[PDB]
Amino acid sequence: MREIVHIQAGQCGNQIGAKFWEVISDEHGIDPTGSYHGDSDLQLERINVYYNEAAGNKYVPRAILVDLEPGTMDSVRSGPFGQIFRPDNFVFGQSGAGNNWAKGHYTEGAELVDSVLDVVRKESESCDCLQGFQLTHSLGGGTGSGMGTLLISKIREEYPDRIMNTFSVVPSPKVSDTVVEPYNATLSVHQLVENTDETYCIDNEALYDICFRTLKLTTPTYGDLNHLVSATMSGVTTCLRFPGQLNADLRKLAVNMVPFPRLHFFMPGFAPLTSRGSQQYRALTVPELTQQMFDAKNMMAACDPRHGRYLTVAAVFRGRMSMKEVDEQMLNVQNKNSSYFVEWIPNNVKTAVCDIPPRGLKMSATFIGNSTAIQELFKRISEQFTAMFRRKAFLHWYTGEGMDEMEFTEAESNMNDLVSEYQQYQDATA
Amino acid sequence: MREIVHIQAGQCGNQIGAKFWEVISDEHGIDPTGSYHGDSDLQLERINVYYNEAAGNKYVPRAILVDLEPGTMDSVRSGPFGQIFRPDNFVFGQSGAGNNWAKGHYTEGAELVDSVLDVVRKESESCDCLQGFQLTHSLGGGTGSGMGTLLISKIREEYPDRIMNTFSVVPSPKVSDTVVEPYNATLSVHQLVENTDETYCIDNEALYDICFRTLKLTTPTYGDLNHLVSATMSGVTTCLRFPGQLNADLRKLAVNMVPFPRLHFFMPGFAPLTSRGSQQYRALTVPELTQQMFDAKNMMAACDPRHGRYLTVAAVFRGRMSMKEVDEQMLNVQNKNSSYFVEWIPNNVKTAVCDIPPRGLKMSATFIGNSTAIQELFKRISEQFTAMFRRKAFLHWYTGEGMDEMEFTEAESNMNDLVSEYQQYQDATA
Amino acid sequence: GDQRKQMLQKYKEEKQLQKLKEQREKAKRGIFKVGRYRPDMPCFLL
Amino acid sequence: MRECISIHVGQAGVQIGNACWELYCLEHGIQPDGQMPSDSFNTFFSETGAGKHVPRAVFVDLEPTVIDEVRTGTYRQLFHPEQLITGKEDAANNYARGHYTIGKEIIDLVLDRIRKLADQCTGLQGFLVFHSFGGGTGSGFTSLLMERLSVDYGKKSKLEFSIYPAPQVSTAVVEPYNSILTTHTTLEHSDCAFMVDNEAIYDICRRNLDIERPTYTNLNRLISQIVSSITASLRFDGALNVDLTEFQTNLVPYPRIHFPLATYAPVISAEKAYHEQLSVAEITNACFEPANQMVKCDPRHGKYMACCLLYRGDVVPKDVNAAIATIKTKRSIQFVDWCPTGFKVGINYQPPTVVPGGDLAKVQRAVCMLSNTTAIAEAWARLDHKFDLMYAKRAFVHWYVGEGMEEGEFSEAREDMAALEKDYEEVGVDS
Amino acid sequence: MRECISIHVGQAGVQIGNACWELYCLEHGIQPDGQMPSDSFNTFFSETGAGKHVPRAVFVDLEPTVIDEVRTGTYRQLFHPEQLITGKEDAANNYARGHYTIGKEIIDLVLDRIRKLADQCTGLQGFLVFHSFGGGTGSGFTSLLMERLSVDYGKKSKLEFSIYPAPQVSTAVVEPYNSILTTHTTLEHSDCAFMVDNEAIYDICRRNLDIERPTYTNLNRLISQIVSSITASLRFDGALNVDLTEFQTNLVPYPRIHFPLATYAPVISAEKAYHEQLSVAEITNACFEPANQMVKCDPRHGKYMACCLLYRGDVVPKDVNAAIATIKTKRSIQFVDWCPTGFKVGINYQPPTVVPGGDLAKVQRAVCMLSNTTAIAEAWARLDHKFDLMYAKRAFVHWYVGEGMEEGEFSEAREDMAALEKDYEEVGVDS
Ligand SMILES: CC(=O)O[C@H]1C(=O)[C@@]2(C)[C@H]([C@H](OC(=O)c3ccccc3)[C@]3(O)C[C@H](OC(=O)[C@H](O)[C@@H](NC(=O)c4ccccc4)c4ccccc4)C(C)=C1C3(C)C)[C@]1(OC(C)=O)CO[C@@H]1C[C@@H]2O
Ligand SMILES: CC(=O)O[C@H]1C(=O)[C@@]2(C)[C@H]([C@H](OC(=O)c3ccccc3)[C@]3(O)C[C@H](OC(=O)[C@H](O)[C@@H](NC(=O)c4ccccc4)c4ccccc4)C(C)=C1C3(C)C)[C@]1(OC(C)=O)CO[C@@H]1C[C@@H]2O
Ligand SMILES: Nc1nc2c(ncn2[C@@H]2O[C@H](COP(=O)(O)OP(=O)(O)OP(=O)(O)O)[C@@H](O)[C@H]2O)c(=O)[nH]1
Ligand SMILES: Nc1nc2c(ncn2[C@@H]2O[C@H](COP(=O)(O)OP(=O)(O)OP(=O)(O)O)[C@@H](O)[C@H]2O)c(=O)[nH]1
Ligand SMILES: Nc1nc2c(ncn2[C@@H]2O[C@H](COP(=O)(O)OP(=O)(O)O)[C@@H](O)[C@H]2O)c(=O)[nH]1
Ligand SMILES: Nc1nc2c(ncn2[C@@H]2O[C@H](COP(=O)(O)OP(=O)(O)O)[C@@H](O)[C@H]2O)c(=O)[nH]1
Ligand SMILES: [Mg+2]
Ligand SMILES: [Mg+2]
């Protein structure tokens, strides 16, 4: 049966992975010590998707911890839910990329990639029927981006027929957390555009907006952001673990949302999102969820879908509902916004329904969108890249590891081509 | 089914809206917490016209709170019946109009109109079959008048077939609460004559007179006047909420009361009004209600109906009564006062009966009159505007916000044409 | 007086003309809303 | 056998229909749930299930308030749920809204229900339509429905029960527009149209029944008594039965003159019943007074063209003949010369039934009179005068024009009404 | 005697089969554990062991979740463990995956199971196939399995109950590709295919059953009721019995036109059954109404080729003949001139049974209606237009190409579909 291997690299990857594993263990009724303490048989009928079974009812997550520095994973191990992970899955170096893509891809990554691949192969041998890989990292960092691209390259060379999902943290538009962020981002998209089956983009600014304006959170920390990202992660793959009226696994989503191989960048979203006091002021129905899906302010990437046209849309619902209500709602959305969908793809929306809702909620829904508005993000990143590349600023750090300006030119050319394709697919021609 | 969206703007609008919502909630048996604790099925049968049912047996009024300063709605929220409103409907600025029409219509209204229209859309799409819009504001203030006209214009563009109702506190004839109220009143009538379906005019001076002379109240406050206005609104919209022997909705009243599109300014009135000590000496009968309604002293507007002639008259009776008595009283009124009714319209009176009594007495009645005598108010405002406009006093305050004298001239010309039309429509010509 | 009336007349035409120009581009794409689904009336053999 | 279908549109139609159906159920001993506690009423009721009777009624309105009142009341289990058809927004005293904008949305559904109900019927002979002239949905949807029915069937009879606007009593400002427009539209589609006046009913209840608080329940009960007296010939056997077609073939001499006047007798209170031994001659006499008419117009101002008499209960044909002869020899009333025989008489065995809680005593004989007279011409002329007063200044015209109605329709309706006045004045001249 | 083998493939087929087999166990009085608590049902249930009846069903899917749900349900101890066949990875809405890559891995096992089940049968009459067009596993595997069966048996009839894509409602983006490919490769390997639309059944549930939350269970129950009405003639005895062969003999005029539409009557709620008498004439009339057809297409837009009527319960042949004649005289519907006789009837004594906790009322008679008409050409044209829209830019093509499909198959399917539309238009012209 279908099983998923999880990998996380860098600080952002490790933090989001820890939050994701806390969420998953809570959903399946697994205590931090690794012993099942649930109250339903459904939590165990499909537990082999994420967790292995050890001797004595103990459950070991099928996860791999990779970093070039030991600080983040030492924090993860010493913290809660640190004993579930098998200690053999903690692979680390001693140098750290230092926010250098070349260091993590060509100098430091080359030493750890063999060990990471060894752990990956050992985990996959135990799998009965592999469904694919999932990976959490950030594009703006050194080790995250470099090692993530290297690992996807190696695995794609190993298993080309499987399914690759990455949950990347693309750079924000207004405030940047690193000076060399455009360099790493461009060099990472150059590999993602050719080695990944599907990719979900995440913006810290969009997450701050959601936290401040919707959740009414005065002091949002990184824990809340990782909580939201983990909720979306769980919502994406709910159909592999619980029964439902209309099922949809990762391959179905990849078929339904990737019309051309080079356009597999999506904007995720979640619903419902309310504060601690305002949730009593609204009913819990399907149309409110549909309203929250197609809200540009609810998107988890800082791109306005109003500026472009949707290609495909995925709506994954959870809980006891009515299929007629969902279908009429999707029809109303499509007809009433006929100007925001491409004319050459009839029926832009794919629908899935799962019976088991999240713990403590009557219903929930996850939105995934393949909109051409992502071209604006790509264009902005490319513009910053070119502005910083004419003066050759900070270039001697990367060229001191083995890279040359030809790689940078190839990356910028590829990004310009991708932006051109995204723009050209907004033409009616009929 | 037939449902009404309520919007209030400015200090007066927010205060009257709070009083009106307290009145309606007491009438429908909803506690301040929002949970129904009534004793009749008819209270819940048509609760959808004003309220939305949330999860857990809770009712949220379909109201929008609009203001350019946070003090008024902060006081509303912190006061009683403040937890009943949805917090997301509170839309406030930070600057304030400062009793300036230009500042509220061009400088802050432009910034707040997008948010207010988004909230209005979110409320209206959740409706089933919208009946119309209703607005509470004044004409002598800056934010009230300016934002009211802006919102009326935008909504009329968005929904040209719905019903727009306004309850506007026109300036008093004797005492003025602002030095620049003629400017705001003229600039707001210039929009009301074109973008509003029908408008009820109420004067604070007439309300003071009613409380001091009829109710024998020694110290009337603004709460009493808001109580009177709220009673009038409930009487007007009572035919949408309870079954009636002969019933009329907003559109029927508009059809029967506006002979020409530019004459939709009415003077409301309520009966019976009596003191605590004088209730014991009077008998509640239909003729008493009829004689109290058609009383110059009882009008809620500072205009004498005897100066002009009625165009149309609407009497919405409430309670259990015999339609024979109502019809005989209407005949008696028409024949006795035949000098106050236009000849070119027979049957000047429209009658409706709602079976359920007001909360309180056994019988009650609401009076709405479309009399040509209201042209005196407009003529007086025009005189004050022209007396203040030759000297260009206070004009730079308005022209510093981008407005020009051409707008003032156009507004004055339009208002004078309206006065001429109201005047010359007193000619029988047959 | 006639010239002032002509100035007012000109101002009214300019106002309506920018109003039409403003509404021309606004109706091109549209606005994002959701609402509810409204069923169609059944067809009949009559 | 022979069957009838009853249609109620608008507030007035629905309320009078509810009163009539309560009376019909009481007459035949049918419980409000539709069952029977112990067979010629197949004309109005259709057998279904295990001894359950469903009336052949269709209720149409463009607002849900009154229909929901019916759906919640005591008779909620008597009517078929699909027979009560409801819109979302009413016409709001606008003929154009009820005829062009809103009526077209549910006219197809109404026709489907009518056809489905008629297909179940083997000997259907006519339809009964209840409405009011002043109302928007009443007049507009009645005109649209009659147009569609005349197109669809043509040969079946179509009777009307309508609330003629009162000369003085009014509850609307735009009444003449709606009345003229609906009369112009329906003049060439209605076989016969009986009318009553709310003002005259008020006067009758005040003078006779000694009631000072006559809510619409009393008026609707009186109208239900009249319609029961009309349909008793179908529902019960008697010495002389009268069908629905006989009314139109005896009362309508020309296709453009089909507006008779309906009265009823005896209308007395319980205290006064004991002091009056009611007989055939005096009730026949009482049916002819202007004060007992149910339309506020003086029959003495015009001439009778055709009269229909319907007797129920203890009635001897010889007494009926003597009373009619005495009425004929009386010169206080007039008849058109070209109609030497202007009387149609029917007698039914079943006496009227008294509804408990009502305001009429128990009598063993009653009379329903329907007369086609020229005295309605002055009422028509008054309506035209009001229309002309309101049309010279184009008051309220924009409300009708904004709903798609052309401005020439008002002129066409006015010219048609003038032609009707000409016809009435020409037919009233002896030769 | 005569026996039928049922095959359910994909999520839709498996769930409709769950509903069908629940209904089947209920109707014959069989407990879910296979033990009867107290015999013409040997067509569907085979006797194995001591009093245990095992249904003749095969459940196939390339994804184990729905079959695992079946294995843990109330009917766990009903199906033979070897009839429930599962794969590891589904087709993922990809026709090529379920036809060329994943289907070929278990097609041999499915055929082996079907052969083992059939060799026991002595009077095998045909196969029943439940699937959906838009699905990947559904369409791809049903095409491959139907091709294999036609190669193997050929002479035995093969029937489908597929879910036609709705004109507006959709749950997939690559739906037209799979639909066109599977109808192209299935057209020459089938005898009769009854199709339904989810949207039409949603409308039926909302309008008639007054259900505001019609989950998939209600739709599956309605489809199960239709299948049970179809197979009642095999499972019981009637005044006029129709087996499977007569369906294709009478409903299929040409080999390339075997797409009838299935309706049902009466579909009413419990509360409305009291106010309606369910006569044969009224249900026969309702079966022809466009608002009751369970495919979103207007019959009035085309002409019927052949019609099949199946009556259950209290039915008398004279009334059936009268109703059919009345339908024939009606001009609202149309028939092709080259088919003077276009009706085939069947009457069975066994009335329909009601699943407890369900939504349909208890009735003494019911009708199943199958119609072969040209109105579906519009739906075919709509599907082909969607195909053309999505194929002019090669959208989603690489997914199919990478699994072993050459690009020429799309063109071949499009030309075959155009040929079928041309056939539908050529047969729709009177001579
Ligand atoms: C009475 C009630 O509704 O309590 C809620 C609650 O108040 C709200 C505000 C919760 C609450 O969530 C948050 O406050 C929050 C803060 C930052 C980021 C995200 C959420 C809640 O924490 C979340 C929590 O939800 C869950 O337990 C879900 O299963 C969730 N799991 C976790 O959040 C979780 C927390 C700790 C450890 C492990 C899991 C989940 C959601 C999606 C997918 C998988 C799991 C619950 C019941 C509530 C609180 C406690 C206040 C919300 O949580 C979600 C995403 O369902 C915020 O949006 C919903 C709306 C709820 O009304
Ligand atoms: C001792 C007693 O029984 O007196 C009655 C009462 O009927 C009198 C005195 C009431 C009373 O009103 C006043 O005294 C008053 C004072 C200032 C301004 C306006 C009113 C009463 O407050 C009004 C109140 O009316 C109601 O029942 C309704 O609820 C009323 N709503 C409220 O009073 C209210 C207040 C706060 C929050 C929510 C509702 C209402 C009136 C009209 C239309 C809708 C609702 C009743 C029982 C009375 C008192 C208490 C004295 C009157 O009220 C109205 C508006 O009908 C004053 O004019 C009538 C004359 C009545 O005789
Ligand atoms: N006799 C009688 N007349 C009634 C009754 N109810 C209403 N009417 C008459 O109907 C007139 C009002 O118009 P309605 O019939 O209510 O109008 P409508 O049918 O509801 O159509 P709309 O104008 O769209 O509301 C009044 O003038 C009354 O004369 C009733 O119960 N009995
Ligand atoms: N009526 C009805 N239709 C269903 C049901 N389940 C699925 N469908 C239809 O099936 C279509 C989706 O494709 P599926 O049949 O589920 O595809 P599949 O059989 O699962 O094959 P794969 O996609 O490869 O897994 C939807 O458009 C539904 O209309 C059901 O329970 N009842
Ligand atoms: N949402 C989220 N983002 C993070 C977190 N930690 C780091 N980031 C983002 O990651 C970026 C820094 O990359 P980083 O992982 O530290 O570089 P690396 O260690 O070399 O891979 C910053 O722009 C942060 O916005 C986290 O816990 N949550
Ligand atoms: N600052 C401010 N003052 C206002 C506004 N609207 C009205 N006013 C002033 O308030 C006075 C009376 O309003 P208010 O007392 O609230 O009306 P009432 O209590 O309902 O009778 C008017 O004369 C206005 O001058 C506003 O929007 N802002
Ligand atoms: Mg009405
Ligand atoms: Mg599947």
Residue numbers in the entry:
A (entry chain A), B (entry chain K): 1 to 430
C (entry chain C): 87 to 132
D (entry chain L), E (entry chain B): 1 to 38, 47 to 439
What do the study's own words say?
The dynamics of kinetochore-attached microtubules are regulated by hepatoma-upregulated protein (HURP) and the mitotic kinesin-8 Kif18A, but the underlying mechanism remains elusive. Hepatoma-upregulated protein (HURP) is a spindle assembly factor that localizes to the chromatin-proximal region of K-fibers in a process mediated by Ran-GTP signaling. Through its stabilizing and bundling activities, HURP regulates K-fiber dynamics and spindle morphology, contributing to chromosomal movements and alignment. K-fibers also recruit Kif18A, a member of the kinesin-8 family that walks towards and accumulates at the plus-ends of K-microtubules.
We next used cryo-EM to determine the structure of HURP1-285 bound to taxol-stabilized microtubules under saturating conditions. Additionally, an extended loop, including residues 115-132, inserts in the inter-protofilament groove and contacts two laterally adjacent tubulins, thus stapling the protofilaments together. These interactions are mainly driven by hydrophobic residues that insert in hydrophobic pockets on the tubulin subunits. Most of the HURP residues that participate in these interactions are highly conserved among species. The deep insertion in the inter-protofilament groove and the bridging interactions between adjacent tubulin subunits are consistent with HURP’s role as a microtubule-stabilizing factor. Our structural model suggests that this function could be exerted by laterally stabilizing protofilaments, and attenuating their peeling at the microtubule tip during catastrophes, therefore increasing the likelihood of rescues. Additionally, HURP partially overlaps with the microtubule-binding site of the Kif18A motor domain, indicating that excess HURP inhibits Kif18A motility by steric exclusion.
